């Protein structure tokens, strides 16, 4: 489908950028006309049927009707598109508090609670995505948004729909492939895909939330790529002796080769800890 082909310019008046991916660039920007603020991303097209540089019609549409669903408080919201001969452009609920990668970088290792509070936001977010059949095949702690570092108990949303496609047969088999950190073993040996994938991501989300560590993390794209598909990770007691024995249980149930055999997101919500680009 076609998106507004005004200039955006005439809309909006940008400013800061606020993230850049391989093509696409996100600026913060102001709308003229109500001075609310959005985070534009602006995502080149590709300029020739068989060209590398850029992002297909195909997936653009795919990512923009995807956020054209989701209303929920854990997720980011799409405000409008705008598109011109060069660019796709996405304007998105701004989140300003920054990358949870980044609140992360700057201390080091969270408590089992604070763990468990930006935990039960992400897995309310994954529900809501779940519930519609969307997985989101890229979540990792870069598309983990703060809307306010500065507070104790800062909330969180969903960001980066690039990579999120409808599953309506409970799996998929369109070749998608995350960062090798954070992909499924089923995404690592190219076999068809299904929402349990997000929920692997979440364990190594969980496990780098209690340590500061990455648990497949090898020293080239390939070594992790492996470590990932053997399963190859365990707990450092120099990380989690003293991080309960449910925060691991918790992991060990996501972190789980057979999709058929992890733990689904219905599952972590009632899970006792918690009720109340692959090449170098
Ligand atoms: N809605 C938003 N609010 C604030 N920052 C954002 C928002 N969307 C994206 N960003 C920033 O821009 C970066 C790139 O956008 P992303 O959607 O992740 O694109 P891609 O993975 O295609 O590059 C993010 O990692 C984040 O730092
Ligand atoms: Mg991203």
């Given at each position: 489908t076609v998106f507004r082909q005004e200039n955006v310019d005439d809309y909006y008046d940008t400013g800061e950028?606020?993230?850049?991916?391989?093509?696409?660039?996100?600026?913060?920007?102001?709308?003229?006309?109500?001075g609310l603020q959005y985070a534009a991303k602006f995502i080149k097209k590709r300029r020739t049927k068989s060209s590398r540089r850029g992002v297909s019609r195909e997936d653009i549409e795919?990512?923009?009707?995807?956020?054209?669903?989701?209303?929920?408080?854990?997720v980011i919201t799409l405000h409008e598109v705008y598109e011109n001969?060069?660019?796709?452009?996405?304007?998105?609920?701004?989140?300003?508090?920054?990358?949870?990668?980044?609140?992360?970088?700057?201390?080091?290792?969270?408590?089992?609670?604070?763990?468990?509070?930006?935990?039960?936001?992400?897995?309310?977010?994954?529900?809501?995505?779940?519930?519609?059949?969307?997985?989101?095949?890229?979540?990792?702690?870069?598309?983990?948004?703060?809307?306010?570092?500065?507070?104790?108990?800062?909330?969180?949303?969903?960001?980066?729909?690039?990579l999120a496609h409808k599953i309506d047969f409970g799996n998929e088999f369109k070749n998608i492939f995350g960062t090798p950190e954070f992909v499924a073993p089923e995404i690592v040996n190219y076999e068809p895909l299904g929402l349990e994938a997000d929920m692997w991501s979440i364990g190594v989300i969980t496990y780098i939330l209690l340590s500061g560590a990455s648990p497949f993390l090898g020293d080239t794209k390939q070594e992790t790529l492996a470590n990932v598909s053997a399963v190859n990770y365990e707990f450092e007691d120099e990380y989690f002796?003293?991080?309960?024995?449910?925060?691991?249980?918790?992991?060990?149930?996501?972190?789980?080769?057979?999709?058929?055999?992890?733990?689904?997101?219905?599952?972590?919500?009632?899970?006792?800890?918690?009720?109340?680009?692959?090449?170098?």
């Open positions: 950028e606020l993230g850049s991916g391989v093509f696409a660039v996100v600026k913060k920007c102001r709308e003229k006309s109500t795919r990512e923009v009707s995807i956020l054209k669903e989701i209303q929920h408080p854990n001969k060069t660019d796709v452009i996405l304007i998105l609920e701004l989140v300003a508090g920054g990358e949870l990668f980044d609140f992360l970088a700057e201390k080091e290792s969270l408590t089992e609670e604070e763990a468990t509070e930006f935990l039960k936001q992400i897995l309310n977010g994954v529900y809501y995505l779940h519930s519609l059949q969307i997985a989101h095949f890229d979540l990792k702690p870069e598309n983990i948004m703060l809307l306010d570092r500065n507070v104790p108990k800062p909330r969180i949303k969903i960001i980066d729909f690039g002796s003293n991080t309960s024995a449910l925060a691991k249980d918790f992991i060990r149930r996501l972190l789980v080769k057979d999709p058929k055999k992890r733990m689904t997101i219905q599952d972590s919500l009632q899970h006792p800890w918690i009720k109340p680009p692959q090449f170098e």
